[PDB]
Amino acid sequence: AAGSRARVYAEVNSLRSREYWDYEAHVPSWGNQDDYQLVRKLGRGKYSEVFEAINITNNERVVVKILKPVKKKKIKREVKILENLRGGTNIIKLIDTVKDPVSKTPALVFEYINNTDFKQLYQILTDFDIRFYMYELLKALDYCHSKGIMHRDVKPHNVMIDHQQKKLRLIDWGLAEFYHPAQEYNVRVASRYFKGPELLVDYQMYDYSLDMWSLGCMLASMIFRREPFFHGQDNYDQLVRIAKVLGTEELYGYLKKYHIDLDPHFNDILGQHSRKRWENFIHSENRHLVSPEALDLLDKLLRYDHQQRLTAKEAMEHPYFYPVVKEQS
Ligand SMILES: CC(C)=CCOc1cccc2c1-c1c(c3c(n1C(C)C)CCCC3=O)C2=O
Ligand code: NA
């Protein structure tokens, strides 16, 4: 299979001190979790239980993410990435790293965000809201990509939005990884519905552009109100659903560009499909959320060829966001 490199920020980690990306050498300092009283269960992630908590030393409201089970290398990665990204635009702020003094189980402490569940929130988003929050999410992605980091789990569940204060934070960096040119990565990342085609065809030399596919999937579901937008029942069916929209010939062109041998089971299920116009998804229930600019942006995100997808920075400059950058400057 042919090689691939990020379009932007490709060499940024090699330009930094080795200490920056050599997370296996990062040694966290573990405080005492008894400074924090757990107050409310908020939810969970793959390897965590997340609680609202009060820091009993200063009455501040925080979030405590308890890591269980525990892979040490993966904890070092999440912690180092969070420290590298601290103070980044719309990146969740890591405040502390602590351990229960009896179980020695590790926990990450974060700033509290008063999230509206996206299933309730997406029912009330306006066209302007979608442009605003997508813009804020793109700032976080441009930031973490400029810091040599792929999130690799971009999905509504990982985008906290306080709709009252109109505040956004990208969370759960436990799958995030440092980008290094020509490195082959594990493709078993992201939720099925947000996996880019590169993951679904087992192309391991991927880069920041994976997050831009996931972001296009979110944009599609918000403006069209079909959530998730590509609703596969398994990883084979996920690629078929994508191909029923972007077309099969464009899929075969991608595979030819990168010399990707396709899992032969696909021969039974892919069929042949023409590219659908994005306008075919418009109807009376989503018409108020769709515009030519939205569709043009979506078209430049949801591309098979990861190398041709917009960068986060290019997406921020797209006319779909002019109403937001006008009322923000
Ligand atoms: C007030 C409500 C209803 C939610 C506020 O949820 C917050 C707020 C601030 C910071 C974080 C979370 C959160 C995190 C994480 C998770 N959640 C939530 C979605 C349970 C779950 C996945 C793993 C993870 O890392 C996380 O870092
Ligand atoms: Na998560």
Author numbering: 5 to 333
The publication says:
Protein kinase CK2 (former name: casein kinase 2), a serine/threonine kinase of the CMGC subgroup of eukaryotic protein kinases (EPKs), is involved in cellular key processes like cell cycle progression, evasion of apoptosis and DNA damage repair. Structurally CK2 predominantly occurs as a heterotetrameric complex with a central dimer of non-catalytic subunits (CK2β) to which two catalytic subunits (CK2α) are attached. For the catalytic subunit in humans and other vertebrates, two paralogous isoforms exist. They are typically denoted as CK2α and CK2α′ and have highly similar sequences with exception of their completely unrelated C-terminal segments.
To clarify the structural bases of 4p’s inhibitory effect on CK2 we determined complex structures of the compound with functional variants of the two isoforms of the human catalytic CK2 subunit, namely with CK2α1−335 and with CK2α′Cys336Ser. In fact, the CK2α1−335/4p complex could be crystallized under conditions with strongly differing salt concentrations while the CK2α′Cys336Ser/4p complex crystallized only under low-salt conditions. (ii) As mentioned in the last section structural plasticity or even “hypervariability” of the hinge/helix αD region—casually accompanied by the occurrence of the αD pocket —is a significant feature of human CK2α, but it was never observed so far in structures of maize or yeast CK2α and human CK2α′ where the hinge/helix αD region was always found in the open conformation without any exception. The CK2α′Cys336Ser/4p complex of this study confirms these experiences: neither do the two CK2α′Cys336Ser protomers deviate from the open hinge/helix αD conformation nor did we observe any crystallization hit under high-salt conditions. The lack of any conformational ambiguity in the hinge/helix αD region of the CK2α′Cys336Ser/4p complex is also perceptible from the final atomic B-factors which reflect the mobilities of the atoms in the crystalline state: they are low in the whole hinge/helix αD area of the CK2α′Cys336Ser/4p complex while in both CK2α1−335/4p complex structures high mobility sections exist, namely either at the helix αD (low-salt structure) or at the hinge (high-salt structure). (iii) Finally, the CK2α′Cys336Ser/4p complex structure provides a further case of a cis-proline (Pro73) residue in the β3/αC loop. The Lys/Pro dipeptide in the β3/αC loop is absolutely conserved in the sequences of CK2α homologs, but it is completely unknown so far under which conditions a cis-peptide bond can be trapped within this dipeptide and whether a functional relevance is associated with this feature. The binding of 4p mainly depends on hydrophobic interactions between the aromatic four-ring system and suitable side chains of the enzyme. Compared to the extensive hydrophobic embedding polar interactions contribute only marginally to the affinity of 4p to CK2, but they are critical for its orientation within the ATP site.
